[PDB]
């Protein structure tokens, strides 16, 4: 090859060094010098930089007025819960029952708990296979 | 570790005596278990069972 970096070839100081006092030459390369740093390519038509013609401002709350199988899907949907809900709406209002018991929370807190879902307490029916 | 339930003055008797090599591990554990740091934690608040 050559000498190592910096060593004038032929003026080494470890030529006839004794082995008993020989010190191993440390390894040093041309990395940490700046001449051997890899630059951007830039003759193959590629610069590493970025600027205009890069950045796009994408609106991604607003992709478009959303697809037809969301609205055409939709308007089918609440044609099929509309009869449900207003039946369930004034099932609340003139279900204006009286009051039992003593008010345990201020003035409310009577026998039944307010707006409690009856399907939960009433939907789990215990059943005996071969009921007897 | 001894840190949050000792005061500092309890078992430095045993540590320095062990770091110097004067006592082996088993003496260090036996002297550790029969110190009042142990019965203040594992003997006082529990029954004999």
């Amino acid at each position: 090859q050559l000498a190592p970096p910096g060593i004038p070839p032929g003026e080494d100081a470890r030529n006839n060094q004794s082995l008993r006092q020989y010190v191993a030459r440390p390894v040093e390369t041309y990395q940490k010098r700046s001449f051997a740093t890899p630059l951007p390519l830039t003759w193959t038509g590629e610069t590493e930089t970025v600027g205009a013609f890069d950045v796009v401002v994408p609106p991604q709350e607003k992709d478009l007025p959303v697809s037809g199988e969301a609205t055409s899907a939709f308007v089918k949907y609440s044609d099929m819960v509309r009869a449900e809900r207003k039946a369930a709406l004034q099932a609340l209002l003139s279900a204006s029952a009286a009051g039992e018991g003593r008010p345990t929370c201020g003035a409310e807190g009577r026998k039944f708990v307010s707006n409690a879902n009856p399907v939960l307490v009433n939907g789990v029916k215990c059943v005996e296979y071969w009921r007897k | 570790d001894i840190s949050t339930f000792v005061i500092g003055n309890e078992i430095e008797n045993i540590k320095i005596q062990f770091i110097k090599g004067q006592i082996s591990v088993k003496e260090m554990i036996n002297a550790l278990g029969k110190s009042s740091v142990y019965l203040k934690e594992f003997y006082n608040p529990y029954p004999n069972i």
Partner: protein, 160 residues
């Protein structure tokens, strides 16, 4: 949601789901794109929907904010708007769940016990949600704000 109580309905009856139940889970998930667009409108309009919600509430019920009202002073009025931010949030849950099941077990079950026990006029908080409804439906079209409308008036119904 419509998915969970269409299941627990057919769960109790020892049967699977009928076409009437499975053509609506099907119809609901194709509706899911349109639901997130509606809840997305109310999500970052809470500054105006709540602020302007408490706008008409005090103009219609000055007693609750006047001295002696429950929401009197700088303190209670802040909490006075805090509850409206709660109920506006639950309506966003009901729109995405396709049902008032999220609004049912949060903010509706036993709500009269809380507000009676807090000294708050429950009719007054019902007036607050109605004022939010006119602001919310003014932010949306045609049918959309119709589904996300039906959820406020359900909360109005259960809150009295």
């Amino acid at each position: 949601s419509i998915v969970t109580k269409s299941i627990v309905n057919a769960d109790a009856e020892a049967r699977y789901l009928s076409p009437g139940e499975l053509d609506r889970i099907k119809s609901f998930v194709l509706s899911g794109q349109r639901r997130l667009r509606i809840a997305q409108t109310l999500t970052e309009n809470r500054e105006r929907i709540v602020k302007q919600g408490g706008q008409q509430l005090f103009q219609r019920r000055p007693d609750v904010v006047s001295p002696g009202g429950n929401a009197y002073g700088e303190e209670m009025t802040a909490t006075c708007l805090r509850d409206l931010d709660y109920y506006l949030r639950l309506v966003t849950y009901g729109i995405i769940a396709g049902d008032v099941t999220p609004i049912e077990e949060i903010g509706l079950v036993g709500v009269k016990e809380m507000y009676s026990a807090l000294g708050t006029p429950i009719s007054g908080v019902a007036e607050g949600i109605r004022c939010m409804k006119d602001v919310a439906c003014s932010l949306l079209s045609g049918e959309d704000a119709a589904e996300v409308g039906f959820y406020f008036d359900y909360t109005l119904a259960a809150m009295q």
